[PDB]
């Protein structure tokens, strides 16, 4: 089928471990530290992945940064959503960090994780494929609505290249549902809503000053 889709598949990064500190007693502070630490190392891996997206690295450095600073949380959330598709009421942040409802309550994340679980429920019934996940991830990046884009036309062309790939993939692979591509695009609003709430939540955590955060994660929180 589609080459952009095959290319995004081979560019998909390897999963990384959360590695919660086994010597630290369980608390909300430990869980939030673990999660922000994981997100920080995933953000490095995300920056490297985006350079494989056709056309992304030919944008100016400021434009590459604007897109990432708008989309980082959507990309992170789509990741845990996809890793969670075969589970039931659990969120697979990492193979060694799977959160159930009780752990979400203790971390103060019950409402945010419930919204992530709603994204999971929708993608399960739609039988979301890996091919579709990596394409939506790239589209989320290109369609992130940064207020600060220099070359608007070039960003809009990146959006069109990825949308075409999604259309081409669905036309060849899902002839039983000629509207599957649009259904996939219609999942993006709930992803944007959940990411908007998540960024504000962790920005509040940053202001309370009880959870240490690393440099890149703080940079992504401050850009917003």
Ligand X SMILES: CC(c1ccc(O)cc1)c1ccc(O)cc1
Partners of 98 in the β-ladder: 92
Q: Which two tokens stand for residue 107?
A: 């971390």
Q: Which two tokens stand for residue 159?
A: 């959006």
Q: Which two tokens stand for residue 133?
A: 């996940």
| Interruption sites in the chain after residues (C→N beyond 2.5 Å) | none
Q: Per-residue x/- marks for its own copies, 73-112, CB under 8 A? A: ----------------------------------------
Query: Which of 35, 139, 155, 205: binder of its own copies (CB under 8 A)?
Result: 139
If binding is defined by CB under 8 A, does position 113 make contact with its own copies? no
Residue 85 partner contact from ligand X, its own copies, none using kind-dependent CB cut-offs of 5 to 8 Å: none
Query: Which of 50, 76, 165, 220: binder of ligand X (CB under 6 A)?
Result: 76
Query: Which of 46, 71, 109, 221: binder of ligand X (CB under 6 A)?
Result: 109
Question: Does residue 190 sit in helix, strand or coil?
Answer: helix
d(C-alpha 45, C-alpha 153), whole Å: 27
Q: What angle do CA 220, 160, 44 make, to 5 degrees?
A: 25
Residue 207 partner contact from its own copies, ligand X, none using kind-dependent CB cut-offs of 5 to 8 Å: none
Establish how many alpha carbons lie within 13 A of residue 35's alpha carbon, considering only the half-sphere containing its beta carbon.
26
Q: What is the DSSP letter of 57?
A: G
The window from 47-55, 74-82, 152-160, 168-176 that contacts ligand X (CB under 6 A) reads 74-82
Specify the residue, 23 or 125, whose C-beta has the smaller distance to its own copies.
125
Binding site for ligand X (CB under 6 A): 35, 38-39, 42, 76-77, 79-80, 93, 109, 112-113, 116, 198, 202
């Amino acid at each position: 089928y589609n080459k952009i889709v095959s290319h995004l598949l081979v560019a998909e990064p390897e999963k990384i471990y959360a590695m919660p500190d086994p010597t630290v007693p369980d608390s909300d502070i430990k869980a939030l530290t673990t999660l922000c630490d994981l997100a920080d190392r995933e953000l490095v891996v995300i920056i490297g992945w985006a350079k494989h997206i056709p056309g992304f690295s030919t944008l100016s450095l400021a434009d590459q940064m604007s897109l990432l600073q708008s989309a980082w949380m959507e990309i992170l959330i789509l990741g845990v959503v996809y890793r969670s598709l075969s589970f039931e009421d659990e969120l697979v942040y990492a193979d060694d960090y799977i959160m159930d409802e009780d752990q979400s309550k203790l971390a103060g994340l019950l409402d945010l994780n419930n919204a992530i679980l709603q994204l999971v429920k929708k993608y399960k019934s739609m039988k979301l494929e890996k091919e579709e996940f990596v394409t939506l991830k790239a589209i989320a990046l290109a369609n992130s609505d940064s207020m600060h884009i220099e070359d608007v036309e070039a960003v809009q062309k990146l959006q069109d290249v990825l949308h075409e790939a999604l259309q081409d993939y669905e036309a060849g692979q899902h002839m039983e549902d000629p509207r599957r591509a649009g259904k996939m695009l219609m999942t993006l609003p709930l992803l944007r809503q959940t990411s908007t709430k998540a960024v504000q939540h962790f920005y509040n955590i940053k202001l309370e000053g009880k959870v240490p955060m690393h440099k890149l994660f703080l940079e992504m929180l401050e850009a917003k």
